[PDB]
Design a protein around this ligand. Structure first.
Ligand code: NAG
Ligand code: NAG
Ligand code: NAG
Ligand code: NAG
Ligand code: NAG
Ligand code: NAG
Ligand code: NAG
Ligand code: NAG
Ligand code: NAG
Ligand code: NAG
Ligand code: NAG
Ligand code: NAG
Ligand code: NAG
Lengths: 182, 434, 197
């Protein structure tokens, strides 16, 4: 196989050799010399996701790692050449992972680049790419009272558009010549 | 053999009308899925796990693994848009007034609880406890570890449940304090009993009924809400419609992951075995057959994922239109917003779905009467302006159509057109003049 | 603003271009060109390698069609919505809220777009609110007086009856209020004079 040989914590039976997961992949192996449990776990991985503004605007980017405590993405470095994203200058940990190269702001605006779990980044002001928490909308508290009614005294006619697709394009394929050219 | 129902028979005749003399407030329930889990898969290590040469050979097939990822990301962003359009239909974030006395109605069971750490209503908490959902992209540090080790991943929703509950509470406060005016422009406060009087007036029942049966209506509403909580708590199969989504998603993921074990006719299901214990010249062919089988499995998986995404999107559009017509207004489309004449609706969040509480009006206690289409007073037909011409006996009166309340027949609630010889069934009666 | 239709066009172009790119996939065979394969193999070997390409390109075609069927189902759902709107919105006035735009519906006008339609929903939006003091009824001679259509409203001293959507104060006469009962059972009733015309 291939993976990190790792110190195990489970127990086999006095005769068990292999250990299997649901999809019959070798989870643990009986050590050859010593009668010790040894677990085979694929060496850690995950998607690499990159947050960018338009290249028409900038060329610096943030990088989001899905499902990592951010204490292992420096563990799994390219050495073991773009380091500035593995190492911690601006490291913010969220439910989706940690995104490096983006500054966490204690404010809250509308959403531009959805990150997940309520966080979503943007590119603002001395220019950096910020990450903040979404804002639902302007706060409001209507003045309820049991002998008070608000009646409008003026109106505004307003017209809005609504785009709707109706039909797609009608294609047609030639099985014989596509599958089997001439 | 199936029984279709209590076989009944209504006593039709041509001079008889049945008018209810009482009513009943009935809170119904309706549970709708909105979104599903946002999975994402990578070929390179699902198919060719830790096998550089397998990756190099998979490079030949190539363009396939951009269709897969493209479809999956489309589905994920579609789920996010579904949630946006179902819930984010309010401009501001309204707040319930600090003091709660809405004319005797008791919304304690639907408004959020500051006591809980999560500001969810008792009903929302009960729903969340009732439905058991799998890990929603929790940071790894179970069945989830099996899938997560094959490149199969679940992304977390962009809308955390707390801010979904914030949308829900904003909608509740808006519809309680303002009415339907907050969905058609700016919020306009109005006392709740007057709002509910308008809601009666919009189903053909005058408001003098509510202003005189306010206590009964409040008590019935409170008891109905309590019974809703008890019923959807005790019965475990009440909301299996949401559990179906989670079951299907986890089940498809399990089938896909353990499908990695099939050999598809090859000598072994693990590639290093084929590479060490077999000659490369046809090892290429054998592992190519394995790759074709696994690509077929992924393609099938995403085809059912796409069909189920389309069905969930249709359900989400239905939920969004129910949120618009039912919650933000008062619909006349019968059985759209619950069995009976629609009064109000109250949204309540739930995992991967939403649940409404359709308040409706149901007549209770009928009574036979003798009716006429018109009344001939001085050789002129006299039709009812609004209502019916019932009569317990020689006492012909004019009531409204949905609640028995007799009135003397005068020239104010009666309009005249014709002579009393064209109408079949006209009845001689006096029409008092004020 | 109208990228919804451009999305359809782009999806169709991409879906129909991945097929054209797919022919350059050897699919486990020696090469993805039929003539070379037939010109460098004995009849028996060719069949084996060719079957690889034929089966591969067939699969690709099914993958493309199935997705076309799914997309056509989505477009049909969208087209059924458009028809419903054109009928209840362009050919009538709708009472379903947020169906024909936000606000109370007035009119709608269709305009033709490439592979789609766009509507111009003419709505009505109240603008300038004004706090008032209201009551459910008006006890005059011991009898409650409920508004025939509208709400009771006072500007601080006098009481009026106005519409529910536009401040239009009126003197309270007996031609716009209906009597129902006596004034000891409704909570919130207030004294006032109801004019007799
Ligand atoms: C291998 O040699 C070591 C050296 O003492 C011994 O302890 C161990 O038991 C041996 N392995 C086996 C399988 O006997
Ligand atoms: C791992 O993540 C948890 C939260 O899930 C956090 O509390 C902890 O500090 C992180 N690091 C370690 C070494 O556990
Ligand atoms: C409004 O509510 C307050 C407190 O709930 C009460 O004191 C007052 O009398 C009410 N106004 C009415 C019923 O007109
Ligand atoms: C109503 O609003 C319009 C602005 O759209 C303004 O021109 C007009 O004077 C206003 N009328 C009143 C009576 O306030
Ligand atoms: C109407 O029904 C309620 C119970 O829902 C009852 O308390 C009341 O007495 C009834 N009124 C009449 C007139 O039957
Ligand atoms: C409203 O109902 C709740 C039951 O959930 C009850 O605890 C509370 O006392 C009620 N409110 C009043 C004012 O009685
Ligand atoms: C009217 O009388 C008929 C015949 O007795 C009866 O079946 C019906 O129930 C009565 N009306 C009502 C209350 O439905
Ligand atoms: C019918 O109802 C009217 C009004 O309450 C009453 O005057 C009359 O006595 C009733 N029918 C009879 C018994 O004549
Ligand atoms: C009701 O139907 C019967 C049966 O034909 C008929 O004799 C009677 O005249 C009808 N009543 C009226 C008011 O037309
Ligand atoms: C109504 O009265 C007129 C004259 O008063 C009479 O000719 C006619 O037959 C009467 N009809 C009924 C149904 O009593
Ligand atoms: C109505 O009164 C409330 C509280 O007194 C106030 O916040 C609001 O601005 C008032 N509305 C208008 C239109 O002045
Ligand atoms: C209320 O309206 C009446 C109109 O009859 C007017 O005489 C009075 O001055 C107004 N009061 C206020 C406070 O606006
Ligand atoms: C209305 O007037 C009557 C006069 O008999 C009086 O008894 C009652 O208290 C008045 N109501 C209010 C709210 O002032």
């Amino acid at each position: 196989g291939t993976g990190v040989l790792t110190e195990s914590n489970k127990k086999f039976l006095p005769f068990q050799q292999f250990g299997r997961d649901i999809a019959d992949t070798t989870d643990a192996v009986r050590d050859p010399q010593t009668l010790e449990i040894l677990d085979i776990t694929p060496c850690s991985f995950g998607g690499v996701s990159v947050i960018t503004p338009g290249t028409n605007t900038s060329n610096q980017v943030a990088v989001l790692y899905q499902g990592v405590n951010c204490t292992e993405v420096p563990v799994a470095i390219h050495a073991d050449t773009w380091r500035v994203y593995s190492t911690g200058s601006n490291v913010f940990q969220t439910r989706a992972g940690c995104l490096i190269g983006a500054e966490y702001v204690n404010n809250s605006y509308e959403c531009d680049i959805p990150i997940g779990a309520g966080i979503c980044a943007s590119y603002q002001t001395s220019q950096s790419i910020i990450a903040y928490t979404m804002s639902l909308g302007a706060e409001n508290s209507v003045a309820y009272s049991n002998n008070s009614i608000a009646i409008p005294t003026n109106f505004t006619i307003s017209v809005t558009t609504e785009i709707l697709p109706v039909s797609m394009t009608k294609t047609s394929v030639d099985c014989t010549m596509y599958i089997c050219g001439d | 053999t199936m029984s279709l129902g209590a076989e009944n028979s209504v006593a039709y005749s041509n001079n008889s009308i049945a008018i209810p003399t009482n009513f009943t407030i009935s809170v119904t329930t309706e549970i709708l899925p909105v979104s599903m889990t946002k999975t994402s898969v990578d070929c390179t290590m699902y198919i060719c796990g830790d096998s550089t040469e397998c990756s190099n050979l998979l490079l030949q097939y190539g363009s396939f693994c951009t269709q897969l990822k493209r479809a999956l990301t489309g589905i994920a962003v579609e789920q996010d848009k579904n949630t946006q359009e179902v819930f984010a239909q309010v401009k501001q974030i309204y707040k319930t007034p600090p003091i709660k006395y809405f004319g005797g109605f008791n919304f304690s069971q639907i408004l959020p609880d500051p006591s809980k750490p999560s500001k969810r209503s008792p009903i929302e908490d009960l729903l969340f406890n009732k439905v058991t959902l799998a890990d929603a992209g929790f940071i790894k540090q179970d069945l989830i570890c099996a899938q997560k080790f094959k490149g199969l991943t679940v992304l977390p929703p962009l809308l955390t449940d707390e801010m979904i509950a914030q949308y829900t509470s904003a909608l509740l406060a808006g519809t309680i304090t303002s009415g339907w005016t907050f969905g058609a422009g700016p919020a306009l406060q109005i006392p709740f009993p007057m709002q509910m009087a308008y809601r009666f007036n919009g189903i053909g029942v005058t408001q003098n009924v509510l202003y005189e049966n306010q206590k009964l209506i409040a008590n019935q509403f409170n008891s109905a809400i309590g019974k809703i909580q008890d019923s959807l708590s005790s019965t475990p199969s009440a909301l299996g419609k949401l559990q179906d989504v989670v079951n299907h998603n986890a089940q498809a993921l399990n089938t896909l992951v353990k499908q990695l074990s099939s050999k598809f006719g090859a000598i072994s299901s693990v590639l290093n075995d084929i590479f060490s214990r077999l000659d490369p010249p046809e090892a290429e062919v054998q592992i190519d057959r394995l790759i074709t089988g696994r690509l077929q499995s992924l393609q099938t998986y995403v085809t059912q994922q796409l069909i189920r995404a389309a069905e969930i999107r249709a359900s989400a559009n239905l939920a969004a239109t129910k949120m618009s017509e039912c919650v933000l207004g008062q619909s006349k489309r019968v059985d759209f917003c619950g069995k009976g004449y629609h009064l109000m609706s109250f949204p309540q969040s739930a995992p991967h779905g939403v649940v409404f509480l359709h308040v409706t009006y149901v007549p209770a206690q009928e009574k036979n009467f003798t009716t006429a289409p018109a009344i001939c007073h001085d050789g002129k037909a006299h039709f009812p302006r609004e209502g019916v011409f019932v009569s317990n006996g020689t006492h012909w009166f004019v009531t409204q159509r949905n609640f028995y309340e007799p009135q003397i027949i005068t020239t104010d609630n009666t309009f005249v057109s014709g002579n009393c010889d064209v109408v079949i069934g006209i009845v001689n009666n006096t029409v008092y003049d004020p």
